[PDB]
């Protein structure tokens, strides 16, 4: 059962950035056992999942160009020495782990 990283993240663009969502635990630990149980249960529930859970909405412009310019200026003022970027690795600092 190849995972998403096994399947698609070997491409250049897809493989460039790959965030980590869960801590890696060595085999033989309570965390590993619980992760295995959760993965099995989630796969079985994915099998017994309904259609409504995969509903998607059309993509639209999140911001206007002028609003994007304003946001860029404000982010630059927030960090005037560094470049503005979505530092998804440093994400935990800005968004609490429980609300990721």
């Amino acid at each position: 059962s190849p995972s998403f990283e096994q399947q698609f993240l070997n491409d250049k663009l897809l493989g460039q950035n790959t965030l980590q969502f869960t801590k890696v635990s060595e085999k033989g630990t309570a965390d590993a056992l619980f992760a295995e149980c959760l993965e099995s249960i989630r796969h079985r529930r994915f099998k017994l999942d309904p259609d409504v859970d995969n509903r998607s909405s059309e993509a639209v412009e999140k911001l206007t160009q002028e609003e994007r310019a304003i946001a860029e200026k404000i982010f630059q003022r927030v960090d005037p020495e560094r470049k503005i970027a979505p530092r998804l690795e440093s994400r935990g600092c800005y968004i609490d782990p429980l609300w990721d």
């Binding site: 190849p2 096994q6 070997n10 491409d11």
Partner: protein
């Protein structure tokens, strides 16, 4: 001569199974008896092929193609007729397979293209059909079939590099894990060769395959044939691996050291070249039992033979442990490091390996090249060794001498002359490719800077459409710098160059002007056209004095 061709059962016109069986037996006996195609045997092959529009079978056509590949039948008419008579069978098979879904056609077409590549003949229709099949059904093929199709397409000389690279990228995306986890040396080597032949950028996959091959080499499960092929493919890739080539140099040095150790004493082992010559003699005897340099040419043209590596069957794994000292050269170990964050080479094989090292530039920035170069000089200057060599191995030796001009302790002028005679015999007998020939000639000119030539010139004059402006102009310069001074031989090519004005690069124009300024020959129109071409080509470069080149293109 001519008795076998007169007596063979060739006179029977019909579609009968008896006729087909008699044709199959006739071609079997042709394979057994007829000599390789060359200067000496030309009329025989012409007449045989002309006699052989015509009704054939799949097996018969495959046998004909294999025989032509083995015997180097490069005559255009023979292939023209063979494809003209094959078109009906292939079309019928294609329609049959199409209707069934709505031998095998792709397999037959691939085999024909392989034969055409072997004889260096181009089959545009077959190559295009294979390209369409690849673009249409690449995901369908399993890993080995896809690898074979990609290798054939890359070996083809007209397939577009961009398209081949995109197909290789898709293949890697599909089967990077299984191959990189468990791939045999032969499959990995073929993958590396197909990547190199079209310059596909697969850095990570190439590195992983190289790591697995190096694990094989460390374990000692690799033959000299495979090691030389690895060196050649790394040279093609410009893969400047340091530890691998240091390991090869150390292997050569220790082999020579043991050779001398046992030669000093009363008991010594036979030489690898001696064993190869004995095996070649045994194969010649086997052929005679079944029935100038025909007995060597057949051995070189045997199906399992590779130009710079001899015959793949003779060579076997080097040994579990070959270096007593710790070798200069696995996935679990890679994972651990990431987590922790801390049986013998031939003379020609040695020549090819050192040619690869010279191309990669080890001779300058290395400490393990000088001793091996001295060893190669010692083994090459000996009489007899140069005579039994391939055109590509001779080119490698010539390159080695030319590059290590100064480093040579002695002056092997006799060895160089004998090598040149051997290579010229190969060239006039058509076993030498223009790519291997231009390198040899340029290397000889470089070595000399600081009859045989007539035969070379006549071969060049008769075979003009086999190579590109690169080789044409480079050889035109090499002959003039060797010293030819033939107004006719030089003025012949003026019109050919005028016609192929377009395909001339800066290197090409440089070679042409060098040749025609060394030969003291005047051609105002040629020079004017070449000058305009050079101006146009350089129009997309700007440079300033004392500041180098600023913007290119």
């Amino acid at each position: 001569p001519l008795q076998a061709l007169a007596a063979l059962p060739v006179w029977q016109q019909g579609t009968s199974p008896r006729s087909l069986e008699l044709r199959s037996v006739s071609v079997r006996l042709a394979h057994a008896f007829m000599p390789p195609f060359s200067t000496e045997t030309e009329e025989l092959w012409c007449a045989y092929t002309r006699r052989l529009p015509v009704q054939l079978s799949v097996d018969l056509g495959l046998q004909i193609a294999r025989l032509f590949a083995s015997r180097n039948v490069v005559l255009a008419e023979a292939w023209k007729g063979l494809f003209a008579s094959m078109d009906p069978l292939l079309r019928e098979l294609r329609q049959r397979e199409e209707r069934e879904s709505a031998e095998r056609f792709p397999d037959v077409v691939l085999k024909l293209c392989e034969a055409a590549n072997r004889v260096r003949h181009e089959w545009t229709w077959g190559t295009e059909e294979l390209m369409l099949y690849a673009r249409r059904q690449l995901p369908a093929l399993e890993a080995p079939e896809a690898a074979r199709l990609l290798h054939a397409l890359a070996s083809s000389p007209s397939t577009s590099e961009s398209v081949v690279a995109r197909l290789a990228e898709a293949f890697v995306f599909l089967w990077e894990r299984d191959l990189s986890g468990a791939v045999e040396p032969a499959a990995g080597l073929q993958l590396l060769e197909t990547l190199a032949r079209k310059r596909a950028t697969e850095r990570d996959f190439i590195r992983d395959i190289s790591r697995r091959m190096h694990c094989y080499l460390h374990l000692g499960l690799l033959t000299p044939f495979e090691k030389t092929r690895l060196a050649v493919v790394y040279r093609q890739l410009e893969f400047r691996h340091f530890t691998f080539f240091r390991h090869l140099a150390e292997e050569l040095l220790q082999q020579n050291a043991k050779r001398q150790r046992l030669l000093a004493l009363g008991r010594s082992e036979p030489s690898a070249d001696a064993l190869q010559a004995a095996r070649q003699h045994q194969r010649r005897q086997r052929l005679s039992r079944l029935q100038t340099g025909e007995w060597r040419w057949q051995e070189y043209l045997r199906p399992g033979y590779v130009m710079g590596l001899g015959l793949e069957k003779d060579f076997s794994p080097s040994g579990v442990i070959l270096q007593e000292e710790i070798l200069p050269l696995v996935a679990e170990l890679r994972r651990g490091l990431r987590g922790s964050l801390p049986k013998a080479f031939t003379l020609g094989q040695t020549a090819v390996i050192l040619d690869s090292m010279l191309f990669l530039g080890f001779h300058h920035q290395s400490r393990f090249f000088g001793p091996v170069a001295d060893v190669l000089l010692q083994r090459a200057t000996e009489r007899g060794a140069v005579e039994t060599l391939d055109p590509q191995q001779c080119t490698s030796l010539m390159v080695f001498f030319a590059e290590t001009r100064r480093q040579l302790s002695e002056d092997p002028d006799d060895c160089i002359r004998r090598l040149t005679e051997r290579f010229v015999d190969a060239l006039v007998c058509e076993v030498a490719s223009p790519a291997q020939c231009l390198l040899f000639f340029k290397s000889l000119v470089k070595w000399s800077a600081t009859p045989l030539l007539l035969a070379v010139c006549k071969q060049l004059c008769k075979r003009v459409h086999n190579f590109s402006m690169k080789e044409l102009t480079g050889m035109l310069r090499a002959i003039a710098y060797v010293d030819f001074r033939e107004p006719a031989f030089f003025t012949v090519f003026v019109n050919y160059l005028k016609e192929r004005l377009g395909e001339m690069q800066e290197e090409d124009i440089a070679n042409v002007t060098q040749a025609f300024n060394k030969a003291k020959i005047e051609e105002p129109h040629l020079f004017s056209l070449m000058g305009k071409r050079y101006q146009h080509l350089q129009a997309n470069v700007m440079a300033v004095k004392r500041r180098g080149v600023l913007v290119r293109r």
